[PDB]
Design a protein around this ligand. Structure first.
Ligand code: ITN
Ligand code: SF4
Ligand code: CL
Ligand code: NH4
Length: 297
């Protein structure tokens, strides 16, 4: 029984398991805390445990390590990676800074630690609009996600310089206007919760535009929802609100990187103390400055 083995190893290692909302149901069921990128970042600043097992993708485990440099942070598989975050390279940031030296560099937390070393502040889908609104500039450098950048431009009225030019999430790019039409036909009493990583014409059909954390916060506003994000979010919402109804917009909206994490390799992570997540001190310090500024804003 992997679940009983994991529970005993958690105790033996003085470990906490942090899980993203897109983790497999059986992984969510053994996590101590579950949340979106911003909540996982905040939760990483009050870790009393000695070991963090991060059931999520590599940039998320790195963010936890940046905020807990003297704790052991484990990722259960090094193949748990984010295709969108990998699209942004330091070269892109440097070129944009050359053109707009007075523009703050605003990096989605969906980014490498190397990239965050060049950020003035980080953001998530939950706080991107608030942060960019308060920055002392009418133009900001922003990436990697161009669909979130479109949403931020619309809501703040500021000029958004995307880095790179085509950054996007293949999972959320799957959603189309035909999925909106089918959801409206199959569930005519449901409202639509849509992630800002979806394309702009789908965003415009939303009843609410929100990160997964915002979806959880605003689900109380209606009793039936079609969920335009990675399909494991439906399980999360059904567990939190058993009295509501939730439907996937597309069952095939799956993140391969997220599903590199399994119950078995969480067990192996605790058993073998692997895979240890490390961030170079110079990169971590600079990234930490931008992430702390995000939490302060
Ligand atoms: C990209 C994300 C993923 C999510 O919405 O859970 C974020 O900013 O929180
Ligand atoms: S769902 Fe998209 S943005 Fe999130 S980890 Fe997977 S590839 Fe990255
Ligand atoms: Cl409730
Ligand atoms: N100013």
């Amino acid at each position: 029984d992997l679940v009983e083995e994991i529970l005993r190893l958690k105790e033996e290692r003085n470990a906490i398991i942090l899980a993203h909302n897109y983790q497999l149901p059986e992984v969510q069921d053994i996590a101590d805390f579950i949340g979106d990128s911003l909540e996982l970042a905040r939760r990483a600043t009050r870790v009393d445990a000695d070991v963090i097992v991060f059931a999520g993708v590599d940039f998320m485990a790195e963010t936890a390590k940046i905020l807990n440099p003297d704790k052991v942070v484990l990722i259960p598989s090094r193949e748990a990676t984010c295709a969108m975050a990998n699209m942004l390279k330091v070269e892109h940031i440097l070129e944009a800074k050359r053109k707009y030296p007075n523009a703050p560099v605003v990096l989605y937390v969906n980014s490498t630690a190397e990239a965050k070393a060049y950020a003035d502040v980080t953001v998530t889908s939950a706080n991107a609009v608030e942060v960019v609104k308060k920055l002392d500039s009418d133009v900001v450098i922003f990436g990697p996600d161009k669909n979130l950048a479109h949403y931020v431009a619309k809501m703040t009225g500021k000029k958004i310089i995307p880095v790179p030019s085509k950054g996007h999430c293949y999972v959320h790019q799957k959603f189309t206007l035909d999925d909106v039409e089918r959801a409206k036909k199959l569930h005519p009493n449901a409202k639509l919760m849509i992630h800002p990583e979806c394309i702009p014409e789908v965003q415009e059909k939303a009843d609410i535009i929100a990160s997964t954390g915002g979806m959880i916060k605003r689900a109380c506003e209606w009793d039936e929802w079609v969920v335009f994000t990675e399909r494991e979010m439906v399980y999360r919402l059904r567990k939190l609100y058993p009295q509501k109804k939730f439907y996937p917009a597309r069952e095939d909206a799956f993140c391969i990187g997220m599903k590199a994490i399994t119950l078995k390799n969480i067990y192996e992570s605790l058993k073998d103390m692997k895979y240890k997540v490390e961030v170079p001190e110079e990169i971590a310090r600079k990234a930490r400055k931008a992430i702390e500024r995000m939490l302060e804003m």
